[PDB]
Design an enzyme around this catalytic site. Structure first.
Site, mmCIF file in Angstrom:
data_model
loop_
_atom_site.group_PDB
_atom_site.id
_atom_site.type_symbol
_atom_site.label_atom_id
_atom_site.label_comp_id
_atom_site.label_asym_id
_atom_site.label_seq_id
_atom_site.Cartn_x
_atom_site.Cartn_y
_atom_site.Cartn_z
ATOM 1 N N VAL A 461 37.042 39.279 41.215
ATOM 2 C CA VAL A 461 37.751 40.306 41.711
ATOM 3 C C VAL A 461 38.224 40.946 40.255
ATOM 4 O O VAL A 461 38.831 40.241 39.440
ATOM 5 C CB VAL A 461 39.110 39.950 42.485
ATOM 6 C CG1 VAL A 461 40.111 41.157 42.746
ATOM 7 C CG2 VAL A 461 38.759 38.984 43.533
ATOM 8 N N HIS A 462 37.849 42.194 40.011
ATOM 9 C CA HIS A 462 37.969 42.859 38.685
ATOM 10 C C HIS A 462 38.824 44.109 38.884
ATOM 11 O O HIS A 462 38.862 44.855 39.654
ATOM 12 C CB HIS A 462 36.401 43.222 38.058
ATOM 13 C CG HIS A 462 36.496 43.592 36.894
ATOM 14 N ND1 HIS A 462 36.693 42.955 35.616
ATOM 15 C CD2 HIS A 462 35.867 44.601 36.048
ATOM 16 C CE1 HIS A 462 36.667 43.131 34.648
ATOM 17 N NE2 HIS A 462 35.924 44.445 34.804
ATOM 18 N N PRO A 463 39.646 44.198 37.701
ATOM 19 C CA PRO A 463 39.879 43.390 36.597
ATOM 20 C C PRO A 463 40.888 42.364 36.815
ATOM 21 O O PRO A 463 41.905 42.982 37.325
ATOM 22 C CB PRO A 463 40.149 44.090 35.203
ATOM 23 C CG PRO A 463 40.143 45.686 35.745
ATOM 24 C CD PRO A 463 40.393 45.575 37.260
#
Ligand SMILES: Cc1cc2nc3c(=O)[nH]c(=O)nc-3n(C[C@H](O)[C@H](O)[C@H](O)COP(=O)(O)OP(=O)(O)OC[C@H]3O[C@@H](n4cnc5c(N)ncnc54)[C@H](O)[C@@H]3O)c2cc1C
Ligand SMILES: Cc1cc2nc3c(=O)[nH]c(=O)nc-3n(C[C@H](O)[C@H](O)[C@H](O)COP(=O)(O)OP(=O)(O)OC[C@H]3O[C@@H](n4cnc5c(N)ncnc54)[C@H](O)[C@@H]3O)c2cc1C
Ligand SMILES: NCCCCc1cn(-c2ccc(-c3nc(CCc4ccccc4)cs3)c(OCCC3CCNCC3)c2)nn1
Ligand SMILES: NCCCCc1cn(-c2ccc(-c3nc(CCc4ccccc4)cs3)c(OCCC3CCNCC3)c2)nn1
Lengths: 489, 489
Positions: A461-463
């Site tokens: 899961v970014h950022p």
């Protein structure tokens, strides 16, 4: 069978007690009496209806930790272009306590609603003590010649009286405070000494540091080499470094020998090294022992041991068959959610028919330090003892936002401990903002026997700071037969 | 065999491109050419070395979301006794952009270090376009009669040119901005209209709302009934409510028909309902389509379809055997960590020998709204379609700290979606501070096929927002044969 006033008497209306009492009463229509010493938080007894956690523990502590964070967050806002007078920034401690008291008070109030409203569940205010296996006496004071208020005739007894801070036992001990007294302090102290290196010492160091008035300071003074015994060694070193940068002077291999009262009100403190110093307040956080010493357990014949701990089997049963004991009074893992689980598993065992013992392995906990710690499972030190071959994965980074915030000291740290054999995850140790939130769901994976495979195979899961769990493939180093090795045989 | 200049040419030096290029070069000692249009972020091309995420996406966006949060956090500090002039609280937008530019710039700089320093990995600046299956041409401009800079003779081609914001196509469209232009705005706008109801619209609404000057406002204007299509319905309603309370006016079943330029610089906006209104800036966030329209894919004979999407099999291969395509240009899930996984799985497949296809199911994502969303797996709407019997667990609470902060609107929400059959967790949907951090480790459990059993059997971490995952035993309601039912047959 219509015998005995109550099916269950619960000494202590805390995390363990109330869970047990409430389950027994509503899900099993049993007649339940719950004993505690006062209905509202505060001195001189501190604990109350709701227990240590609600009244003088987890809840008010985190409220105050949240408060102290604003010091950092306000500093940090400037990098993101929040112009506002920083000379006008001294936190009002009285407003915090008022607010914190309001919140705890409303919980105490919501627990009186619970009793009046819930059928077969009564609250008995005083000091519980055993007389025989089937009789609990409630007294005005803990002095066992106090006027007797009630004699509760009961089939089962559940001891859930929790624990109590330990004192230092030196000339000057009575002039020091603890967690209990810290929560009611009239003023934030200018010159604060937190004695101890446990999670309470560290969390309160951070609070006092946030609420210190202009020109004030906090020393953390610890008996040993490195604070937070039984935590990941590199996490402890990194936090020691970050308390430093946040303005907390950490002192090690240091012990007060003597405290005396000055004329203005402050305290003179003599130490090991010869050093003498003055502090507005001195807070002892050097451990918590069970409260079994006034329950006169000797009379009922329930088994005591290591510091008044109630000796207890897996299913929480004492030496006497009808008397059980849960929570901090047993002196296993001293956490709220554990006691709650023990109490739940007591009602299921006895009143449910369906026996269950609380599972004490790989239970995630947190330290609400600044910055915070999230941990679940074992250090590499104990993994390397109980396991042939051990992989240690490790990663430290500075979230890009601290290039802007100015807080470049805020290294976020993750260490994973593996069994080389099968890849199983034996331990996860995180330092940094959001760690206590992340570790909760780590604790679910570790319950399901997650391998390191299961981590790095998960799309990230970014950022995020948590996405670095799923980016740890190559071990930093290993342990074969409990000795550290660069690389594997 | 010494044939062809490069083993691999990569059109697009973004999330997908760089992962692939870098893996191919260092782990498989291949000769890799990476094409992009500029080495540093900014107008007029925006994207650069590092790609959309680094330059005009995830990274700068979250920096700015972090910035806007300080508005809330500073408000909230007062309850905890942080006295300081609140009239003196207008965020400087110029200082934020400067800082954000500094950070993106240093990443671009660290990517030039990567190329010069890494053997067999070269960077080719211009506009990639196919000529045949084994030849990529680089031009000065995207105009396909521009001076030709390089002809790259290559064995494999990887198309990773990502995506580009969609326009509204009405009289006035050219006077509006997008994500691209929003990041370089000279001044924070006083009167801001965000058109759209996707995660970009919502995240930027929150930014503009935090950085709005004194007296300013943000409208969010959406075509449809409820913002954030394909998200948990009750999470979308709760966020709509919380944007409201944070000062964002949400407007639905509303579409600009016409925009015209006023004398002072602002924009007149006509809508469906007849309403006309003036905004200092108007930002379109109405979707992102692939960039395939200048790659002249027709010439190489690679298969296009739905909006220029590169038609691609599981292993990312186009109609031509040696040409592959990953990331947003394929128009599957448009997230950085997905593209990174596709690129990684491309190098393993082709150059590794060990084939792997990216797993697109139950990938956790987040919305950096205020407050934020963390989601993994399926809505109850699609669960109830693809599954006989479906349990919906649901819990909403207000963390006690908001009794002090004044932010009583900040309901933290968790919904879990089950298969009744076996208890499997099909979906987890969280709204509230820390959700994106919590969901990452939820995404690991869901990968390992976690049942609801596995959640509520986990000892909790107190006090935390995540511990409410492990306190959800009784379903709120069900779905048998895709129709909602109070209780189960
Ligand atoms: C400062 C501090 C911070 C903490 N923070 C956390 C945290 O963040 N997370 C966490 O998980 N845990 C935390 N803990 C631990 C947590 O408070 C305890 O583990 C938990 O309260 C134990 O529950 P229990 O049921 O064993 O007893 P308690 O919750 O302590 O309840 C015991 C009750 O028994 C009553 N009692 C005592 N003697 C008698 C008697 N003779 N008759 C009748 N009643 C009696 C007391 O008044 C008290 O209300 C913290 C503890 C402290 C001190
Ligand atoms: C505002 C915004 C916010 C986002 N936030 C998030 C988030 O929080 N989390 C998340 O996971 N995802 C987020 N995304 C999505 C993320 O940016 C993309 O999914 C990701 O960048 C896709 O990677 P890619 O490899 O497909 O292409 P990109 O990363 O877009 O790289 C494509 C590159 O190709 C170059 N290029 C284009 N045409 C040519 C050509 N003809 N020749 C050569 N080079 C060319 C471009 O200049 C660009 O640098 C966000 C996107 C946007 C727009
Ligand atoms: N005759 C049967 C039907 C009775 C039906 C019935 C319920 N109540 C009732 C009354 C109280 C509570 C609580 N309040 C808090 C504190 C929460 C709080 C307080 C102030 C502000 C914000 C939040 C913890 S628990 C409660 O929760 C049941 C769970 C249990 C969990 C284990 N501990 C005890 C409570 C049930 N009143 N009537
Ligand atoms: N000859 C073989 C040995 C070469 C050895 C070699 C390494 N580099 C090198 C150079 C750069 C980076 C990066 N930087 C960022 C940006 C990080 C950043 C920037 C500024 C401030 C704070 C943080 C992302 S990646 C890098 O990371 C490798 C992973 C990959 C992950 C997939 N994308 C590409 C990079 C390796 N230079 N020399």
């Amino acid at each position: 069978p219509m015998s005995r006033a109550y099916d269950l008497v619960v000494l202590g209306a805390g995390s363990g007690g109330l869970e047990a009492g409430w389950n027994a009463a509503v899900t099993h229509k049993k007649k339940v009496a719950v004993v505690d010493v006062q209905a509202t938080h505060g001195p001189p007894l501190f604990a109350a209806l709701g227990g240590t956690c609600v009244n003088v523990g987890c809840v008010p502590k985190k409220l105050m930790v949240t408060g102290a964070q604003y010091m950092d967050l306000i500093r940090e806002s400037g990098g993101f272009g929040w112009e506002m007078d920083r000379e006008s920034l001294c936190p009002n401690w009285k407003t915090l306590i008022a607010a914190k008291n309001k919140v705890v008070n409303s919980i105490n109030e919501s627990y009186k609603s619970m009793f009046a409203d819930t059928e077969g569940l009564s609250f008995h205010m005083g000091f519980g003590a055993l007389q025989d296996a089937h009789t609990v006496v409630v007294r005005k004071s803990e002095d066992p010649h106090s006027d007797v208020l009630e004699t509760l005739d009961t089939e089962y007894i559940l001891i859930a009286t929790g624990s109590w801070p330990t004192r230092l036992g030196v000339p000057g001990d009575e002039f020091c405070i603890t967690s209990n007294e810290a929560f009611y302090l009239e003023d934030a102290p200018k010159r604060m000494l937190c004695v101890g290196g446990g999670y309470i010492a560290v969390e309160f160091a951070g609070i006092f540091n946030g609420y210190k008035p202009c020109g004030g300071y906090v020393d953390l003074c610890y008996r040993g080499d490195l604070i937070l015994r039984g935590f990941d060694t590199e996490v402890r070193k990194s936090l020691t470094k970050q308390l430093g940068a946040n303005g907390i002077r950490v002192r090690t291999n240091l012990n007060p020998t003597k405290i005396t009262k000055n004329e203005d009100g402050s305290n003179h403190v003599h130490f090991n090294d010869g050093t003498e110093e003055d502090y507005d307040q001195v807070m002892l956080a050097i451990g918590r022992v069970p409260r079994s010493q006034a329950l006169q357990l000797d009379k009922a014949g329930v088994r005591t041991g290591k510091n008044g701990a109630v000796q207890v089997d897996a299913y929480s049963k004492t030496s006497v068959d009808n008397i059980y004991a849960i929570g901090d009074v047993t002196n296993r893992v001293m956490l709220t959610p554990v006691a709650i689980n023990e109490g739940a598993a007591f009602v299921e065992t006895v009143f449910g028919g369906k026996p269950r013992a609380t599972d004490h392995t790989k239970v995630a906990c947190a330290v609400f330090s600044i910055p915070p710690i999230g941990t679940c499972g074992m250090t590499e030190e104990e993994a390397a003892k109980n396991y042939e071959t051990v992989a240690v994965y490790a990663s430290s980074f500075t979230p890009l936002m601290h290039n802007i915030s100015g807080s470049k000291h805020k290294e976020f740290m993750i260490r994973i401990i593996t069994n080389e054999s099968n890849g199983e995850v034996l331990g996860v140790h995180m330092l940094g903002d959001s760690a206590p939130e992340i570790i909760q769901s780590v604790g679910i994976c570790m319950k399901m026997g997650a391998k390191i495979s299961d981590f790095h195979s998960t799309i990230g899961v970014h950022p995020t700071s948590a996405e670095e769990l799923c980016s740890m493939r190559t071990p930093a180093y290993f342990y074969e037969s409990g000795k550290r090795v660069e690389k594997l045989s």
